């Protein structure tokens, strides 16, 4: 079941998935620095999280070089453009809860699910790097959960709306790269299950009850 990491078929799919990961890590660095403009008293903790994202970017860049793959960065920039646009719109409006739901909840849960699914089908070099990034993703999820938990009563409506707009985008993003992910021996159903578990757990921690979490699923489905 392990892929042939040397095949042209594998390298071609890896060129796009690796580019998406590298671009995602860079955008995550930029997103945490940007949140510092909304939360000036959190600048030092946000700088620490952003520095972790740059370490992740460096490690994943090394994964592609190790396999002799040239990352398709243009494809990766286009892939993230709709979610990037929604983050920038919220940032411009000073909508800290939306920025945090996009980056610290949705994007971190997408990273955790992708990395968890990739680990068992990864080459030995990339496996160690990916295992070494996972604890940081939980730190990032925890940062977003803690702020949203502390501020839940002022932003329930905004979070429902951020979810309605951005959760279907994450679903479309998975559909776009499910083909390449299957070449990497990653199952779309496992990617979805892990993402939903992480996202449900974050919403529970923040303070949403079962009905409210189901309302968020209903809003995204409508
Ligand atoms: C189907 C597998 C596609 C891989 C998607 C990976 C998205 C990158 C997630 C990184 C930006 C998140 C972070 O570092 O917090
Ligand atoms: C990596 C996993 C990304 C897919 C998770 C998205 C869950 C789908 C939930 C409802 C909002 C989707 C829709 O039908 O538009
Ligand atoms: Fe990261
Ligand atoms: Fe992260």
From Swiss-Prot:
EC number: 4.1.99.5
Annotated Fe cation 1 binding sites: 25, 53, 56
Cofactor binding note: Binds 2 metal cations per subunit. The catalytic dinuclear metal-binding site could be either a di-iron or a manganese-iron cofactor.
Annotated GO MF terms: aldehyde oxygenase (deformylating) activity; transition metal ion binding
Binding site for Fe cation 2: 53, 108, 140
Record-linked InterPro entries: Ald_deCOase (IPR022612), Ferritin-like (IPR012347), Ferritin-like_SF (IPR009078)
Record has Iron-sulfur as a keyword: no
Keywords associated with the record: Iron, Lyase, Metal-binding, NADP
Catalyzed reactions per annotation: a long-chain fatty aldehyde + 2 NADPH + O2 + H(+) = a long-chain alkane + formate + 2 NADP(+) + H2O
UniProt record similarity statement: Belongs to the aldehyde decarbonylase family.
Job description of the protein: Catalyzes the decarbonylation of fatty aldehydes to alkanes. Requires the presence of ferredoxin, ferredoxin reductase and NADPH for in vitro decarbonylase activity. Involved in the biosynthesis of alkanes, mainly heptadecane and pentadecane.
Entry protein name: Aldehyde decarbonylase
Biological source species: Prochlorococcus marinus (strain MIT 9313)
């Amino acid at each position: 079941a392990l892929p042939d990491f040397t095949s042209d078929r594998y390298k071609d799919a890896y060129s796009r998935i690796n580019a998406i990961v590298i671009e995602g890590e860079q955008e995550a660095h930029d997103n945490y620095i940007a949140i510092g403009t909304l939360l000036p008293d959190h600048v030092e903790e946000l700088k620490r999280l952003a520095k972790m994202e740059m370490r992740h970017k460096k490690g994943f860049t090394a994964c592609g070089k190790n396999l002799g793959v040239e990352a398709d960065m243009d494809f990766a920039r286009e892939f993230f453009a709709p979610l990037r646009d929604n983050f920038q719109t919220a940032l411009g409006q000073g909508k800290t809860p939306t920025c945090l739901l996009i980056q610290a909840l949705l994007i971190e849960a997408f990273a955790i699910s992708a990395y968890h699914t990739y680990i068992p089908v990864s080459d030995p070099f990339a496996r160690k790097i990916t295992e070494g990034v996972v604890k940081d993703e939980y730190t990032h999820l925890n940062y977003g959960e803690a702020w949203l938990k502390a501020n839940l009563e002022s932003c329930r409506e905004e979070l429902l709306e951020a979810n309605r707009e951005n959760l279907p985008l994450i679903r479309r993003m998975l559909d776009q790269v499910a083909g390449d992910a299957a070449v990497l021996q990653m199952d779309k159903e496992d990617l979805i299950e892990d993402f939903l578990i992480a996202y449900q757990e974050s919403l529970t921690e923040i303070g949403f009850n079962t009905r409210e979490i189901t309302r968020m699923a209903a809003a995204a489905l409508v």
